[PDB]
Design a protein around this ligand. Structure first.
Ligand code: HEC
Ligand SMILES: CC(=O)C[C@@H](c1ccccc1)c1c(O)c2ccccc2oc1=O
Length: 461
């Protein structure tokens, strides 16, 4: 498994960096091929680059590449396994369960779509409160996704002002700010620095503990008020799954793992959806041509009366294309989340030892040159055939693919569509600075992409 020969202790840091480490991977693939080795300090990593190599690993050899890889910082900042950081039987079981409860009608009488439709109405309520004045959408947009998860786990969304909510929001946001500081990377290359400067990770652990104890409060309220026969949320389902397991036992389902699975969902379900929404509005501000066509579809398919629903997406190929294009263009998780091989595998004549960390280049699939002609540009036609119909692609991998594919793929797509169509149905977007002037190019800091700062006005139609 070829790759640049590492220096004594610093590894390949001089070539990949700490900056846009995704750009370096693409450049490195031009010289070492689709399957190459990289060193983050002493740790050996295998990077998979093209669609062919990603498909082959994630799908063809799905089981073998279903392990979750964990870097030094993440390892020290995590106490307890839920779904995101889990491996083996613990992962397999908790994930299967979560996917089951996350079905549209997998948690009682009320559907996920319904909880998302209520939030969309509320999102609009809040944007109306801005009275069409210059606004930084970062906050409002972040509240909606967090609240959807709150609704799924507690059965009750919160008013955007409830203190419980703001505390939860604050911790989630604090953790992001920390994980998004460049220098975090120094820890991944030099794990010993964790012992010397523990401030970072002690803080993440603290924040997680705050959230766990807060969720514990909730599960305790749920253990009291629980009507087995009538589950209403993720907790109710978890609690009653524990009862199905009371007789088998040692068991993967515990209050501990419930707390861990709950925070994982808040963490994995908030930030990325939030950032995508913010990035979508920026792009819509930049391309009013595009926004006008999306509004044409809204006006014709959905009234201005009723609220959007998922049934409408099929009759809204342009909007669907715009949303797909937003995710494809922004490349939020350029290297997904680290994977690890489940066993000693032979891959494309290479030989990768059990436990080896695997980095999946989502960028390289999302920005494939043949599939998406001018990949670096925002163009909804990337998902439209000659007739204005939705043109799907197997290269559309923003949620990754295979056994570890985003558990919230359905939920996220539901939020993006309903929130965005709801916003554009009730408001027109006005930029203060003017379009031709603002830049939409992603800013990257470590292993996550984000948009630049901007403001806009939500003008009622
Ligand atoms: C349930 C709420 C939820 C929402 C909403 C959500 N995710 Fe996830 N996502 C998860 C969970 C849970 C995992 C962990 C999956 C695992 O480790 O098995 C995950 C994992 C991922 C991964 C890991 C891929 C890999 O190969 O392991 C990527 C990439 C990802 N999500 C992208 C996204 C994007 C992009 C969005 C939205 C724009 C999004 N997610 C929204 C829950 C969510
Ligand atoms: C936060 C970190 O120190 C590194 C981070 C990461 C993300 C993408 C590609 C490489 C490294 C990381 C995670 O976000 C992560 C998330 C869930 C489970 C395990 C993880 O391990 C990581 O290293």
């Amino acid at each position: 498994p070829p790759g640049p020969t590492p220096l004594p202790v610093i590894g390949n840091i001089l070539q990949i960096g700490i900056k846009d480490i995704s750009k370096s991977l693409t450049n490195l693939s031009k010289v070492y091929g689709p399957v190459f080795t990289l060193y983050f300090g002493l740790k050996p990593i295998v990077v998979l680059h093209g669609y062919e190599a990603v498909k082959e690993a994630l799908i063809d050899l799905g089981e073998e590449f279903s392990g979750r890889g964990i870097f030094p910082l993440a390892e020290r900042a995590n106490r307890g396994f839920g779904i995101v950081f889990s491996n083996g039987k613990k992962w397999k079981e908790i994930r299967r369960f979560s996917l089951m409860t996350l079905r549209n009608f997998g948690m009682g009488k009320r559907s996920i779509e319904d909880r998302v439709q209520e939030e969309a109405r509320c999102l609009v309520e809040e944007l109306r409160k801005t009275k069409a004045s210059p606004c930084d959408p970062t906050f409002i947009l972040g509240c909606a996704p967090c609240n959807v998860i709150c609704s799924i786990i507690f059965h009750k969304r919160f008013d955007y002002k409830d203190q419980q909510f703001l505390n939860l929001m604050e911790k989630l946001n604090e953790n992001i700010e920390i994980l998004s500081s460049p220098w975090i990377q120094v820890y991944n290359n030099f794990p010993a620095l964790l012992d010397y400067f523990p401030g970072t990770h002690n803080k993440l652990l603290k924040n997680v503990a705050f959230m766990k104890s807060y969720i514990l409060e909730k599960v305790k309220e749920h253990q009291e008020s629980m009507d087995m026969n009538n589950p209403q949320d993720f907790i109710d389902c978890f609690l009653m799954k524990m009862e199905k397991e009371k007789h088998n036992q040692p068991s993967e389902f515990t209050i501990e793992s419930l707390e861990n699975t709950a925070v994982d969902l808040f963490g994995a379900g908030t930030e990325t959806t939030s950032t995508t929404l913010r990035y979508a509005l920026l792009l819509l501000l930049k391309h009013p041509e595009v926004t006008a066509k999306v509004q044409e579809e809204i006006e014709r398919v959905i009234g201005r009366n009723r609220s959007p629903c998922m049934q409408d997406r099929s009759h809204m190929p342009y909007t669907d294309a715009v949303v797909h294009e937003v995710q494809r263009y922004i490349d939020l998780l350029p290297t997904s989340l680290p994977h690890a091989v489940t066993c000693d595998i032979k891959f494309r004549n290479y030989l990768i030892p059990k436990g080896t960390t695997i980095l999946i280049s989502l960028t390289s699939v999302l920005h494939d040159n043949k599939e998406f002609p001018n990949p670096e540009m925002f163009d909804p036609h990337h998902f439209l055939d000659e007739g204005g119909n939705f043109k799907k692609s197997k290269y559309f991998m923003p949620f990754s693919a295979g056994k570890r594919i985003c558990v919230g793929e359905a939920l996220a797509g539901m939020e993006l569509f309903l929130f965005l169509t709801s916003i554009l149905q009730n408001f027109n977007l006005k930029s203060l600075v003017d379009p031709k002037n603002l830049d939409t190019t992603p800013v990257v800091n470590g292993f996550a992409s984000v948009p630049p700062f901007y403001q806009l006005c939500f003008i009622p139609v």
